[model samples]
Target: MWQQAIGDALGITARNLKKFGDRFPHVSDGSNKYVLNDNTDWTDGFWSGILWLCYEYTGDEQYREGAVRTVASFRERLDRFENLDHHNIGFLYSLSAKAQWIVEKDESARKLALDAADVLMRRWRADAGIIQAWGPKGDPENGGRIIIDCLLNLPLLLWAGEQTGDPEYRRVAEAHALKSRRFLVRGDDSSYHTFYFDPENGNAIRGGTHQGNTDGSTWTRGQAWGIYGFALNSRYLGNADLLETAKRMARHFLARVPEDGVVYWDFEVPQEPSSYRDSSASAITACGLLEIASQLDESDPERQRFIDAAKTTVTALRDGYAERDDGEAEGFIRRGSYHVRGGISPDDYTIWGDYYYLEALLRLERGVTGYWYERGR
Candidate 1:
């Protein structure tokens, strides 16, 4: 199943490579068609990451060339400071620029990744002790918000700290991760999509669901990000608490999986036939579960459970959610929820979902984690 899924995924990626030359995919339309753009959205890196994954599997020059080209585009974005605000620089460069450096030991790409990391550092808010999730510096609305999604993005800073031998980068990342563990994660292990802080004095204002059922409900994707992010940070920082945090979030997430093996956009969403689903959440959660399992020793009792859940989730995605026969479709997986409450996409193919879907398959089939962190780092 993994081999076929991987082969089919590579074919789909090849098609997208021809379709998207200079542009990147964010989300697919109702027709499963991606409207490509430049490195505008935080998701462009997923496409580049996907290219790198295909290259890693097949050693195909096309994937290498595609990834390299996207790195150049990312370099341009960095040089021009276009859309450089917010805390997603890792999403932009880690997979494109950093992946090249990781794969080929390209010094130029290494320099580019570090440069992008410097850009990411600007989002660090000292008062809040967290990286601002969005907006222009003091845009009252987003200046002091920390989103769960940023947990995955923090690896860029952690990687940068190691690359530059600077303690500041690691310091900011650790502070944010600690804050996230304190605030964004609730007592029950459910997660908040975003948390607001008083930008002036760093007082945490309140937690907002952002894209979930309500301010109190858990967005499934955020939970997935929490699981994956904490697991990565736990390894990067060697924090047992965060690893336990990842395990707790994983257990919470796994217990809520519906009979279909896919998750609703929000775990608290009313379950009905008409209820929407987020396959991307399932894919990402699978990756997170895999991460948690990888950290656990083989003798550990819960390790098998995590591996089982991860494999089953990916199995469900491959068996039912993927565009297996839709050769015309642009996305690998379907039914991704970009924003349910905001009425954005709700159910379409998300580029991030596609990237993680292939990523999880790779991990299961090859024991290879994605570009979030290096092996020896």
Candidate 2:
């Protein structure tokens, strides 16, 4: 079943090669149709990441050509600083440039990824010990804000730290991660989507949300990010506590998901027949669970729990949520809610969801972890 899902995903990518070309996707419409835009948002890398994944799976040059073309476009994006004033640079570059470097030893792509790491570094505020998630630097609404999503973004810095052999990049990434671990993750392992601090004095202000059920509620996607993001950070930093934190989050997430393993848009949202489910959250969590399982000792009993949960969640997603022969479908997975609070694509396909769904399948089938860090590190 896993191999079939992986092969099906590769076929879907082959179909999208012409459909997506060098463009990027944000979210799908109600009909599951995606609008291809320029390298405009934080999601362009997922498209390229998919192409790279296909290339790796089939050893196909066509996928490589498509992936390389997008990497070229991303190089221009980094050079021009287009839509680059955000903290999701890892999300943008890891799948495109760094994946290229990892797969093909493309020196140019590696340099481009390092350049993106520099761009991400600009968002670091020394006073707050966090990276600003959005807005022009110090915008009143977003200044001094460090988001849980940035946990995934810190890897670009960590990779840069590793590549350049400079401890400063690692230092800032660890600092920002520690702040997220302290404030963004709550007492019950539920994660706040964002947190704020007084940048001048480095004092924490409060926790909040942009796409969660409420400021105090746990968004399933944010919780999934905490799971996968912290696990990757644990691997990079070799921190036992961070690994345990990721496990704590995984237990919380696993407890709340529906019996079928698909998650609703928010953990705090009331469960009803008509309630929205975010398959992307389950997919992301599966990948994280696998990562946690991979990091544990063979004798550790917790390892099997993670491995079982990952397989169960991913198997359920493959059987129930994945799109199969829909020519009109521009995404691989179904029911990926983007912004429920804003009435945006609440039950549609999301680009990141599709990327992670394929990634999780690849992981389950072949132990691939994508380009979050170096292979065999």
Candidate 3:
């Protein structure tokens, strides 16, 4: 109920940054014109996913037709561009587009999904055995490493490989995942924000400046990403160890959540004494935990616990964090801090947070599995 109102409000916010994964830039101050377009109309990656539910929720053809048009816009770019940020294209364009194409047999949608897989395939940097994210702003050398979000992005490539009989996509996706297991992901119940890989040699260079820090720290969203990333990886590759890692991170996140059901922008020791609570992180984490719970065997005792925690977090946000009306601002999850201080500001609502929050609520109401392969309601 609240999800539709929130999404409809955000859909009109100008200049909002809602990536398919990891980051969700909020314009709390309204300094950024509330505009939402960018070099990447990226948030639309989950458009199909969202529209899939919204159509059912509202039984509105407007939602479904709008999704087709929005996806078509993305497909237009995939043909013109060579390489893209993996998650941006894969999650945003490929996944939804492919599913739509399969059902509707939309030739254009099929082309876009295929083209995204092909473009992503070309981005494989053999030296690092990882697919490279676009260089940071100006420095081409800055974006050589793999990010935890790639775990979600790579499956599209894997699917593309299967659909097209192309080995390159699988090879690069595997290489990136292999290197990510070694570097991007951490063993200490934490993760690097974004890894800087040596594009020249394919070795992980180091962590880059993200979420206002540069050392080995846990970005709240990164932690949530890892929880889902590993979970998704396990689904794709049938790896038990990755699923174990997902459960470990889920436990760690659950342990740190505040009584208010919100998480500090970063879970690690803060640089300052007062960090804002990020409802966006709470929303995303809820989605991840819900998956972990739903995917566990029906008789699994702990599944209920996980479900409870996720519900507690999401319910808090729906009741407290999100604004119920679309009066003055976009109806995204408010108090959703992006950074502690330095990078993106605080006390803002991010589009992806709204996206994940809606996704989580929809799944919960429908009894859909959090992880893939299980039947969605």
For each candidate in the order shown, give its overall lDDT on alpha carbons: 0.89, 0.88, 0.63
TM-score for each predicted model, relative to the true structure: 0.98, 0.98, 0.82
Candidate 1 error regions (>4 Å): none
Candidate 1 global TM-score: 0.98
Predicted candidate 2 versus true structure: per-residue lDDT over 193-217, tens digit per residue = 9998997977989999989989999
lDDT at position 222, candidate 1: 91
Ranking by TM-score: 2, 1, 3
lDDT for 120 (candidate 1)? 92
Clashing pairs in 1: none
- Superposed on all Cα atoms, the candidates' RMSDs to the truth, in angstroms, are 1.1, 1.0, 4.9
Give candidate 3 misplaced runs (Cα > 4 Å).
Answer: 1-33, 38-41, 46-49, 82-87, 102-107, 136-140, 270-274, 326-329, 339-345, 368-377
Worst 10 residues of 2 by lDDT: 323-332
**Which of the two, 1 or 3, has more lDDT?**
1
lDDT of 1 by residue, 223-289 (tens): 9999999999998898999999999999999889988889988888786648888998899889999
Residue 355's lDDT in candidate 3: 64
**What clash count goes with each model?**
0, 0, 15
Candidate 3 residue lDDT tens string, 186-304: 77767776787666666556764467245676778778877877776666666677777778888988888776778877776552436676777787788878767756788988889
